């Protein structure tokens, strides 16, 4: 009864180290359908899949050390990166220059995450608040507070208005974006977090812990609608589908699965990494999965509808 | 002929569709379309005939395209938003539908459109334990249902659905229902209105009778008995009247039988009336199996009459019949969850072996209630037998169908439900308490003892307390702790032992120990009192006094059975003390007869410590190498293996980098700290490696950020690093990288520092280290101010301490002293004094004495070198001895370079070099020699011979090499022999060069 | 401090070089430098201290608090639960569907919806369909596939 | 007059810690049988046995942890040693020159086992590989791969075409060196091996087991024809006779017992070595054992034919 899944492409050695993380963007109205990837280098590399394959066409890179978080934003061409460097430095994506930088050490910024609108670009500090800086408007206008520990996701509803954040210990705050007053906070898991997405429409907020199990939360109260368990080791990365139907996560154990979250079971587990993948997405209407691992490889998969 | 006719097919194709003739009113219509495919009227007509008969999606399409062209027609849209509703999809409906309301605004079919919408998601919410939603859906379905009944109050359908609508609400948790109604359903229509549970009912049981009166049909007299059911059920279940309903019921009766007679052909009717007549208040339990049986025979595909007479059986003691009427309705209906639920209560009575796999396959179906509670307290049973970890029943369920968490969800969505119940709070705490997610479990405790301080409180009060006291003590809130702890009797082991513990975390250790004592009194269980005579030696340690803390332990070793806690804490109290005799009469005890125990790794730490302790210092490594000899599998030895080799004998670097990526490779969650020790050996080790890139420390050190970015000692194994980095890139001369990012570093440190529990001698250490690497680092890369500045803040911080001085010395002298200048004594006197005063530490010394030599004072600087090699060997260390001993080599080699008289520095040279090779076999030290010799009596042989041997055996280094390979290039230009000369070339051009043959080329042509 | 000064040439001789020693780790490994300069040395304070030495380590495992024993475990409280069934929660109720739909007119020529009307989808003891069905006199006990029902006494 | 066993030799203090691995070859058909040890020390020591004694030769070292494993060649004169670091040396055995530095990866190499005529010194992998280093010529030639746990101890046939590998779990895989093909699992003990040795006229394979009991197998088949339960504590080495009528093991409580295939009875216990013995081996004929312990004591005893 499941559908035909199967890979497309395989890029042999992309980088020359790990790569930990990857964006898909199919920004512009037309076929753009761009690859941004972040390894431990100076390089951001910007990927194009052009027709059946990918193409580099861009090498940028102005880092001094590994870069943690890259994104990518639909409604402009323009990328952000952040490195242990301690610099939010963010590139144009078009002539392959570097726009603007932003000094801000691993005790002001772990990872990014863009606006909806692609105006905020928020991060997550050390001392717990998440700082809100401001693309082609300056710097660092205000930072929500939550008295915790080391913050590790930031995710955006894309409706605006739901700000999530997990931690180092646990614990999950979810801000409103309207007036910067913590709503309620979750207690979730007992280990670090260091993944969260919301779904589209913005109802359904899916976490993923250091201990393998998968919560599905429900927004706008506390209930939960069950916790996903299949995995043999932590989890890193959760992305979820452009239809509310499908999830894809990736773990530390070298194995991809794709959950969905009308019956909570798993679909298809894809074996083929060889070692731990720390980056999938979807892309656009979501059809084609990337999965960007800790071995060299790009991997781009076929999810058919 | 093709087309052109459209006005024909139009006629025919209506005369067709008006009469029930289907079939040809479509190809008419189609044909129609074949004609001229733009008129919206042909599509529109063609869509409802096929909607007429039984396609609904060609309808659904042929609607869409009338609807494309002239979009300003409400009736052609409405239908498109019809007909995709009626599929599901309601979203998309109730937007399409507020976009009509939006253009136009007395739309009453748009306003029926969302109304019913709204409730459809709201039975969905509540087909899943998501209230909330429900609630607030229902909320906004009567603002819409009201909104509609404004303008045209004659229909009964928008009352029927009004009255489903708030109705619909029953079983939803009272406390959790404010719904805020408004205008003409509460009578005169003043405002705004917030309605609880009860009046919710009562309303709608008005607008019930309200619609009824103008349409008297069968539906509505059903759906209205129904109701008067549901308000009867709310009244009894909150207790609040009993034979005050009994009209109320009666009405209920009374409102079925008539629908029920009205018409007798409809399973639905009966099904009701049978449910109705069994209530508890009621009784009558002929009629229903009467009801019951009417209704299968009316129509035999029902699951539900078959499952209510089961459940009738059921609680009238026939478990076999109930059994049979299971089975069949089941049969009926393979997916319908009621009789799963029923065949598992069946099961449990009879005392089978499925019953708990029974209740997970129905928890697994939709989530209903009393399944839901019979998992839960099965999978809680369980786990508290514990005779049970090897049957297969507990392995099997528990840790291969990861019951746990499923029953967690479970009850929380259960208890989310009820919200009345002790035993299903107590029961989620308990769960939550085994997944470490302890908040949630205090929570829960508390809400129980919320719910109980009104109950009989012998033996359902009192362990709540406790339970909810010890879990809050757990989790800081002493304060807390104590005040709850206290508000029970203090009579049972239990609550003394968790008063005690609670009152010893906030301090208060007289009082620990006599809460201690008053346990240890009333102990049976001994295992408890080997436990209880271990927590008094802790806790009146802590005060001091350790002679009886010692004696209790001996006391307890005594017993009849040592319990293997006892004789750990002895060990680490002998530790905790120079005595160091006592710990190897303990360890050697408890590896005499105790093998039970599954750590393995706390018995290597304490050996290790025990020899330590001791100061051998080698022998430590050494068995540790032997324990992880003896259990090649276990990671945490190869880590612990890795850790002990970076801090005591740090000559195996290569060992310890082996051995931490071995500890790395075997599992994940050993990452963090077998990586970092992996980083700290490279440093230590410096580059004897294949120069390849993607291994060096710096590498390493990065993937241990990524694991853990929470502790202190990564970010400083960073700042060293890129120093590092810098050093061997400045060697290689091709590009100094990661240049200023020392204080973002020293912060981060600093802020993870902040919130660790106590390792207080490590952290001080930690800060100290990381504020003189940062203050060097600036100074080395050219930052002068900012270091100035930052040595200024931290001495205006706190008075004096002779490390920070030094380095605002250090800062002072470097513009001064690069630049050749000339100083007073007096500063010379004031950098002796301060390095004098903070002395026993070899760099302090090694720098003055490189001062004096900048500066020029060959003999004083000898002399501090002196100091330092006897200080460093004094203290046992080795690198800095070495790092003494040639850097003097270095200075009198200098100082003999200008040919000075007073023939000394020679015999300084020598005895350096040959102390050096009796340590080691420095190549640096060889190259001394043979500079030494090449200056005194140039000479030919001998002196060719040593620096042959030096340029020609492989194993060194290229920059040595390259040095020896010049001077014996001049030495061999000027005792002529162009055929060594020329092999020197080809020796120089096997390897890569530029120096050597350009000197050649300089001094082939004279 | 004897001498109090030194006088040198500083270019000695313009042929050779100066020596530059360079120290990588702790392990003995030295290099050697060209340019003239400072002794520049690597990891000058020595190695970061990692993870703290064995006899504090272990006094906090074992002597911080009495919290680790299995005194204070999860376990060693040994509760119970009382079961309540309840089957009456089993009993389903299932509701009718609206008989009616607000539906449109059509103008019988050119066809234009005139307005939205409804119709109807297909003791006080009405006369219009009403048949007196007796719910006591005699009550049919067999169920559709046993032998045998139940009597219940009559109330 | 019955010539009994008799201890015939002790050596005091043969290293300054414990002593986990002995090797005698009878390489030279002189009166050479050279002995080798190595014992968790960077020393390893070669003596030799010249007509009732051990004198030293020489001890030869580099090495950073302990050695756990040396091997000594029948064809030609040349020694093996690997260690705690994954670090192979070879020993020309005439002079104390290392040959060879076969160096290895974090999980490459933890015993070793030459081929029958001095060619393949195949060795064991912390993850389950038997991969082979050509000796003197290659490195890594191949590696034959099996899915299971740690695998400490390689046995190695005689005559050839059979290799057979113990792991951790205590599952024996048999791997015929003719081709490579996997022949068949034997799943043996629930408990680790540490040692597996074949037979002269290699028909008849023993196990030696982490529970103390010793199996007997028949390669031709799965025949567990035996099973032997006389060691108290583990049992670390086996070895047979260059007859099939009787071999040593080596238990963990003090016991070196000799047992027999042909009645599978104990015919002599020996009592020495008041610390765990850790290794055990036969000389060019029945004659000579040798016994080194944890003790710093090497032990050479006597057993006529």
Not at chain 1, 263 to 286: A, L, S
Not at chain 3, 80 to 109: C, E, F, I, N, Y
Request: aromatic share 8%.
């Amino acid at each position: 009864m499941t559908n035909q899944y199967g890979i497309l492409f395989k890029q042999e050695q992309a980088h020359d180290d790990a790569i930990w993380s990857v964006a898909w963007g199919t920004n512009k109205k037309e076929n753009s359908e761009t690859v941004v990837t972040g390894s431990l280098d100076d390089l951001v590399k910007v990927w194009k899949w052009r027709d059946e394959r990918l193409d580099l066409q861009w090498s940028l890179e102005g880092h001094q050390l590994g870069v943690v978080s890259v994104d990518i934003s639909h409604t402009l061409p323009i990328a952000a990166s952040s490195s242990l460097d301690a610099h939010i430095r963010l590139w144009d994506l078009e002539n392959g220059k570097q726009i603007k930088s932003i000094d801000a050490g691993p005790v002001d910024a772990w990872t990014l995450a863009f606006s909806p609108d692609s105006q905020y670009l928020a991060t997550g500090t050390h001392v717990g608040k998440v700082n809100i800086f401001g693309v082609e408007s300056g710097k660092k206008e205000y930072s929500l507070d939550t008295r915790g520990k080391f913050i590790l996701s930031i995710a955006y509803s894309p409706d605006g208005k739901y700000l999530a954040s997990g931690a180092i210990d646990g614990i999950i705050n979810i801000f409103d974006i309207a007036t910067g007053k913590l709503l309620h906070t979750l207690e979730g898991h007992a280990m670090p977090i260091r993944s969260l997405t919301f779904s589209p429409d913005s109802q359904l907020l899916v976490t993923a812990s250091d201990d393998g199990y998968i919560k599905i939360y429900d927004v706008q109260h506390a209930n939960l609608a069950g916790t996903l368990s299949g995995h043999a080791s932590w989890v890193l990365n959760v992305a979820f589908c452009p239809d509310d139907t499908h999830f894809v996560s990736s773990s530390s154990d070298k194995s991809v699965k794709v959950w969905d979250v009308g019956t909570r079971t798993c679909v298809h587990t894809f074996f083929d990494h060889q070692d731990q993948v720390w980056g999938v997405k979807y892309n656009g209407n979501g059809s084609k999965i990337v999965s960007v691992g800790d071995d060299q490889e790009i991997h781009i998969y076929d999810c058919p509808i | 002929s093709a087309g052109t006719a459209k006005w024909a097919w139009l006629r025919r194709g209506l005369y067709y569709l008006k009469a029930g003739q289907h079939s040809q009113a479509v190809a008419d219509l189609q044909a129609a379309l074949r004609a001229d495919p733009k008129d919206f009227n042909c599509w529109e007509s063609l869509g409802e005939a096929y909607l007429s008969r039984g396609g609904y999606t060609t309808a659904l399409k042929s609607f869409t395209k009338a609807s494309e062209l002239n979009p300003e027609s409400i009736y052609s849209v409405f239908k498109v938003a019809a007909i995709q509703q009626i599929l599901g999809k309601y979203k998309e409906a109730v937007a399409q539908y507020q976009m009509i309301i939006k253009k136009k605004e007395d739309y009453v079919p748009a306003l029926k459109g969302l109304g019913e919408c709204h409730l459809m998601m709201a039975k969905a919410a509540l087909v899943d334990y998501l209230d909330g939603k429900a609630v607030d859906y229902i909320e906004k379905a009567l603002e819409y249902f009201t909104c509609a009944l404004q303008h045209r109050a004659d229909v009964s359908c928008l009352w029927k659905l009004a009255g489903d609508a708030c109705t619909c609400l029953y079983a939803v948790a009272p406390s959790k229902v404010n719904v805020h109604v408004l205008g003409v359903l509460l009578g005169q229509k003043e405002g705004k209105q917030v309605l609880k549970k009860n009046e919710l009912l009562h309303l709608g049981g008005r607008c019930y009778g309200r619609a009824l009166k103008l349409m008297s049909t069968s539906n509505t007299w059903c759906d209205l008995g129904i109701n008067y059911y549901r308000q009867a059920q709310h009244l009894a279940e909150t207790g609040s009247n009993m034979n005050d309903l009994k009209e109320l019921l009666e009405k209920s009766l009374h409102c079925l039988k008539k629908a029920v007679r009205l018409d007798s052909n409809n399973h639905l009717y009966w099904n009701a009336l049978g449910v109705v007549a069994c209530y508890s208040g009621i009784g009558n339990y002929a009629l229903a199996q009467h009801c019951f049986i009417k209704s299968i025979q009316s129509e035999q595909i029902n699951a539900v009459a078959w499952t209510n007479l089961g459940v009738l059986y059921l609680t009238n003691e026939n478990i076999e019949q109930a059994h049979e009427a299971f089975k069949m309705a089941q049969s009926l209906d393979p997916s319908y969850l009621m009789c799963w639920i029923g065949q598992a209560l069946i099961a449990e009575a009879v005392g089978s072996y499925d019953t708990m796999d029974l209740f997970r396959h129905t928890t697994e179906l939709n989530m209903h209630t009393e399944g839901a509670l019979g998992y839960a307290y099965w999978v809680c049973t369980t786990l508290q037998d514990k005779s049970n970890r090897e049957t297969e029943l507990y392995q099997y369920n528990i840790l291969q169908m990861n019951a746990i968490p499923a029953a967690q969800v479970i009850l929380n969505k259960y208890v989310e439900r009820i919200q009345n119940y002790a035993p299903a709070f107590t029961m989620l705490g308990y769960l939550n308490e085994h997944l470490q997610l302890k908040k949630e479990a205090a929570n829960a405790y508390q809400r129980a003892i919320l719910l109980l301080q009104t109950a009989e409180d012998q033996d359902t009060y009192n362990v709540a307390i406790r339970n909810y006291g010890r879990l809050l003590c757990s989790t800081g809130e002493y304060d807390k702790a104590i005040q709850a702890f206290k508000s029970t009797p203090l009579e049972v082991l239990e609550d003394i032992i968790g008063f005690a513990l609670a009152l010893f975390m906030k301090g208060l250790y007289k009082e620990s120990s006599k809460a201690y004592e008053r346990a240890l009194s009333i102990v049976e269980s001994e295992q408890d009192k080997a436990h209880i005579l271990t927590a008094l030696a802790i806790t009146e340690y802590k005060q001091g006094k350790t002679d009886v803390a010692k004696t209790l332990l001996f006391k307890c070793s005594i017993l009849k059975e040592p319990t293997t806690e006892s004789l750990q804490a002895l060990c680490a109290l002998g530790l905790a003390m120079q005595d160091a005799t006592l710990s190897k009469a303990a360890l050697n005890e408890l590896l005499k007869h105790i093998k039970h125990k599954d750590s393995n790794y706390q018995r290597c730490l304490l050996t290790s410590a025990i020899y330590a302790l001791q100061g051998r210092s080698v022998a430590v490594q050494k068995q540790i190498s032997k324990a992880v000899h003896s259990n090649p599998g276990d990671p945490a030895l190869w880590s612990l293996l890795s850790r002990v080799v970076a801090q005591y004998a740090q000559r195996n670097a290569k060992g310890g980098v082996v051995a931490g990526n071995v500890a790395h490779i075997l599992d994940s969650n050993h990452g963090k700290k077998a990586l970092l020790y992996t980083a700290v050996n490279q440093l230590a080790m410096g580059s004897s490696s294949a120069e390849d890139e993607k291994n060096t420390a710096l590498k390493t050190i990065q993937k241990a950020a990524l694991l853990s970015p929470g502790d202190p000692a990564i970010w400083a194994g960073l700042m060293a690093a890129c120093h590092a980095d810098d050093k061997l890139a400045l060697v290689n001369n091709t590009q100094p990288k990661r240049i200023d990012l020392y204080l973002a570093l020293l912060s981060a440190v600093s802020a993870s520092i902040k919130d660790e529990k106590f390792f207080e001698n490590y952290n001080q250490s930690l800060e100290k280290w990381s504020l003189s690497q940062a203050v060097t680092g600036l100074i080395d890369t050219g930052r002068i101010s900012e270091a100035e500045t930052l040595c200024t803040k931290n001495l205006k911080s706190n008075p004096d301490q002779p490390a920070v001085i030094l380095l605002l010395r250090q800062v002072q002298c470097k513009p001064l002293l690069e630049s050749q200048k000339p100083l007073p004594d007096a500063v010379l006197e004031e950098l002796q004094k301060t390095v004098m005063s903070n002395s026993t530490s070899v760099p302090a010394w090694q720098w003055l004495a490189h001062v004096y030599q900048s500066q020029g004072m060959m003999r004083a600087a000898e002399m501090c070198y002196r100091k330092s090699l006897q200080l460093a060997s004094q203290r046992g260390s080795w690198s800095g001895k070495l790092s003494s001993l040639l850097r003097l080599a270095l200075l009198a080699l200098k100082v003999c370079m200008a040919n000075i008289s007073n023939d000394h520095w020679p015999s300084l040279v020598q005895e350096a070099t040959t102390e050096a090779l009796k340590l080691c076999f420095c190549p640096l030290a060889v190259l001394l020699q043979a500079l030494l010799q090449f200056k005194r009596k140039m000479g030919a042989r001998e002196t060719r011979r040593l620096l042959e041997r030096v340029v020609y055996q492989p194993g060194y280094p290229k920059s040595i090499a390259s040095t020896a390979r010049w001077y014996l290039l001049r030495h061999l230009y000027a005792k002529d022999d162009y055929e060594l000369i020329d092999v020197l070339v080809n020796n120089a051009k096997t390897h890569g060069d530029t120096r050597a043959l350009e000197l050649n080329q300089r001094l082939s042509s004279q | 401090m004897m001498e109090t000064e030194r006088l040198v040439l500083p270019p000695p001789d313009p042929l050779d070089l100066p020596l530059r020693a360079v120290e990588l780790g702790c392990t003995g490994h030295w290099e050697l430098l060209n340019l003239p300069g400072a002794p520049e040395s690597s990891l000058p304070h020595g190695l970061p201290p990692c993870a703290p030495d064995l006899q504090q380590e272990a006094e906090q495992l074992f002597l911080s608090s009495p919290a680790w024993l299995p005194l204070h475990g999860v376990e060693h409280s040994a509760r119970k639960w009382q079961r309540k069934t309840d089957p009456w929660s089993l009993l389903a109720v299932l509701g009718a569907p609206v008989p009616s739909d607000l539906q449109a007119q059509r103008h019988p020529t050119t066809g234009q919806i005139l307005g939205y009307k409804e119709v109807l989808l297909e003791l006080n003891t009405r006369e219009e369909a009403e048949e007196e069905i007796d719910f006591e006199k005699d009550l049919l006990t067999i169920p559709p596939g046993f032998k045998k029902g139940m009597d219940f006494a009559p109330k």
